[PDB]
Paper text:
Here, we report the structural and biochemical studies of the highly conserved C962R protein of ASFV, showing that C962R is a multidomain protein. The N-terminal AEP domain is responsible for the DNA polymerization activity, whereas the DNA unwinding activity is catalyzed by the central SF3 helicase domain. The middle PriCT2 and D5_N domains and the C-terminal Tail domain all contribute to the DNA unwinding activity of C962R. C962R preferentially works on forked DNA, and likely functions in Base-excision repair (BER) or other repair pathway in ASFV.
To gain more insights into the assembly of C962R, the apo protein was subjected to 300 kV cryo-EM analysis. Three-dimensional (3D) reconstruction and refinement further confirmed that C962R assembles into dodecamer, which is consistent with the size-exclusion chromatographic profile, AUC and SEC-MALS analysis. C962R dodecamer is formed by two ring-shaped hexamers. The diameter of the outer ring is about 140 Å; and, the height of the C962R dodecamer is approximately 290 Å. The C962R structure was refined up to an overall resolution of 3.67 Å. Although it cannot be predicted by the sequence, the structure revealed a compact domain for the C-terminal Asp833-His910 region. The domain is of α/β fold in nature and was termed Tail domain hereafter. Dodecamerization of C962R is mediated by the AEP domains, mainly through the hydrophobic interactions between the side chains of His120 and Tyr238 residues. In the apo structure, the six Tail domains are symmetrically arranged along the central axis; the diameter of the inner ring is approximately 50 Å. In the absence of DNA, C962R exists as a dodecamer with the AEP domains located at the interface of the two hexamers.
Author numbering:
A (entry chain G): 10 to 271, 287 to 363, 372 to 564, 566 to 668, 678 to 692, 695 to 710, 726 to 763, 779 to 922, ...
B (entry chain M): 413 to 549
C (entry chain M): 688 to 709, 728 to 763, 771 to 775, 779 to 825
The structure:
Amino acid sequence: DTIQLTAQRKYLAEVQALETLLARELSVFLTEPGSKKTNIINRITGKTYALPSTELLRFYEHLEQCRKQGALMYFLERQGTYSGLMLDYDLKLNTNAAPSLESSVLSRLCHRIFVHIKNSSVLPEGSHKIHFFFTLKPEAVQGKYGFHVLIPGLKMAASTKKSIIASLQHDATVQKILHEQGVANPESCLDPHSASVPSLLYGSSKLNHRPYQLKTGFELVFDSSDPDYIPIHQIKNIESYNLVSELSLTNEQGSLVRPVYCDHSLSILMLHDPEARYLHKILNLLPPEYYVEYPLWSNVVFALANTSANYRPLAEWFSQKCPEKWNTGGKEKLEKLWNKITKRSIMYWAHKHAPQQYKEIVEQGYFSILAEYVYSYNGTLEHYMIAKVIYAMMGNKFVVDVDSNGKYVWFEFVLPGQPMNQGEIWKWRKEVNPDELHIYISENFSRVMDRITEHIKYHLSQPHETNILNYYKKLLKAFERSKSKIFNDSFKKGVIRQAEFLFRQRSFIQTLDTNPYLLGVGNGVLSIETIPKLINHFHEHPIHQYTHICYEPFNPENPWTKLLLNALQDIIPELDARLWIMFYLSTAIFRGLKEALMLLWLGGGCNGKTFLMRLVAMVLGDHYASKLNISLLTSSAFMRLKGRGYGYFENKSEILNTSRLKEMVNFQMTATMVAASNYNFIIDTTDHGTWRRLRHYRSKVKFCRFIHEYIMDPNCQNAFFSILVYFWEKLQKEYNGQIKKVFCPTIESETEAYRKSQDTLHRFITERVVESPSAETVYNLSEVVTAYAEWYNANINVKRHIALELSQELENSVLEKYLQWSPNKTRILKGCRILHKFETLQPGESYIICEPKNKWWEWSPNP
Amino acid sequence: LEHYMIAKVIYAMMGNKFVVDVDSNGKYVWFEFVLPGQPMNQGEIWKWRKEVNPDELHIYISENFSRVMDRITEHIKYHLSQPHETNILNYYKKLLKAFERSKSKIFNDSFKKGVIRQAEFLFRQRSFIQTLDTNPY
Amino acid sequence: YGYFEETNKSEILNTSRLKEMVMTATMVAASNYNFIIDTTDHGTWRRLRHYRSKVKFCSYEKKRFIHEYIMDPNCQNAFFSILVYFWEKLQKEYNGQIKKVFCPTIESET
């Protein structure tokens, strides 16, 4: 309808003139909805007006000139307490044939109506003229007919009109007259509401309804002297009169007709927003459970709220779709929820539930928009027009953001059924050129071009006035001139360049792959925000990075699951050590904040530890897992940790720089770090902070298809991924995801033994120093420094010791919990004792694995 | 209508939101005053952001300038409607045909780029980048 | 603000670096042990302030700040309010002059 409204509001100079006049001075006459000053209602613009008679004449003059050209108009006039009379007779026809209703029958009906008026009313005494009009429906639909009777000249009250209307319902003469015309129910022909509803201005109609066409008009002249003399004559030459002005009930300045004195907020939102209208058109496509079920309804209201802040009336209306759930929740919960997903999700759901209605609605929208541009500029198309119609057409598949290099970059949302790389589904991919947007413009857009071609051809076929046909002929000509340009390479490139602005979504790059709880996998996107899910459908999550492994839920009965579990148990038979190692490695898939822990995992070779590390690296992929050179530790490469989740190392007795390790375990550090070797490293430091975050463990079992083939096996990688995510979930449920809380006595003992064997201070503290609550002797930083000096000289090697440096080392060592500030502002030893040569521990002085019957990987209910 | 014409009209129309000044690199740079109700990053409100290309201006010429073109359209159409002397009516019809011939060009990409380049001089505000962020208070 | 945010043991010597310290940013250095250089108390050393922390978290022993409260936007807003408030107080009292504020403990430790 709006397309015809468009066409009719250009080539029809009169329509444009009327709209301009209404907009430029009749807007100052606007009235707020519900005001009684309303007399003219625009059923299109939804605006009500209050016109003075002087400007009312010009308006009626504009309404007459527009009407004669066949324009479709939907005006209404407000009839109130004191106005003219109107009668509606919606005849119900027994047969499809339209009754003739010759002029004599109409004259008889007018006589009968005036008889009823005379009986049931009080009229002024003297000579008066009463004008009658009979507007008839142009064609009888499915045995349904009707006509209107208008009496603008008479002026009575609403009570008088109601009394007259009730009186006519009992008129035997009119009933019998309608009887032979084929009326099923003559008594129900009259509308009792005819005195209440505002009536259509002449020439108007209802939506998808033809206007009532004037059949003939009768003139009646009555006098008080001879009440029984009723002259009736047809009005001659009616077509030369301002029919809209004459037929206006409220108008009092008619040339012929003379005065004989005897909720809106939702509509405003819909009419002021085409996009809201489109949403309403597609919201009815949703299944009934999307407003009664709280999760779906909450998702919908959240999507509306995120879409914009003025969609409240739609949120009210959609929540109001169920009476009981509007009250069992609803009318208050809507306020709460109003106070991540957008229209794309609703759009996809509408496609999923009602695909064919979805398709029809979207194609009609494309046609309407594209034709609105065509109608707006005489069929000449430029780059921005097609850019906007493409954005409206495939705005849910591309996003453009300016990268760090200042160049616009096109991203595609990969859907099943398109050529792609392996592991590239349900994600975003970088494209140097929107190749699919180049093919789509040429192919799929041509369909919308065609639809308008047949639209214009059909309008040419219809019988119109000669100027309309000529104008359509010119419009079509310009259109095929403009049609072939979508195949021109320069035109297409320009359209892409213009569309780079519409498809621009700011902050896509910096919001890309930021979530550590989402992971890109071969079959889709993995989710670990809640325990337990795989996203393998349309979604708004901005995922670009991905790894080629497909993810499956944990299936213990899988042969690869059992094989990998057996290899794991063989490699690390200790329950505590295996559980701790697996929970630590389960964080490798996690790309968020870490606990600042690093491991020096030693081994005797051919123990499978390198196999395990290689398996983890290949499963996580090069995007998330990286190899780190050991040469950095013995000394650009720092940047390799960006966005990763796993790091590893793979000669004899390397020297480890304490500064490199201190800087490593400090963009942010979001990678799990492990050091693997066959020779024990040498650590040249004594600070407790560096050592406490370090671990040492040695592989012992030696093995005497896995190494070269099963690691390449995709099924093995998938099963290992299930294993790894299952340990991560188990660790999160049990210990709130904390790796320090897992008890590993073997690993802890090995780490302590390695630390004592490498650091002299720690072994000195654990051997020659014993905590004693009784012995609180003041081992001042100085004294204890000296005792270490003789300890080192008499146990390891003779060397020159400095009190200051040893005191500083002791400050940050494990003893720091026992050092307290003396009142003399000097560091002293409190609650501790020193063992001298050949000294043993005194009383009260202390030095400073349930194997499951079931499977170890199984859920152990022993917290 | 040619590039400088629409450039001046746009400068009058949105001269309160964009500033152009050439940096030390010898290239003109666009700045935009961010207002509430627009897409932006966090904390980018009521502040000037460096734009590689004036996407807002490009869209603005297509949408908001179209309103003024439309208003001139019904203005000249109204003068057509009124009874005038024949030569005046012919003049107005010729001006119309010209108007519509030149009307669609605001959607053309090359025309839009030319208008932007021409307006780069009108929007120029010397010493802006040097005085940018200079106040310590 | 420029933070020298970490160290290993005693800091290195800094005579040429302090000649450079003698610029629109506040400076601070966060070692656990003493620096290998210092100067005359009215020569280049006049600009060095020293202070050593006393309390220990485990009146010098006390019982989420590092990993949770640090990233809360409201916490950062509150700390910004604290900073601007203290700036206002210093400006109103000492007219923005930092030497006029009496710090006997810092002076003594320095």
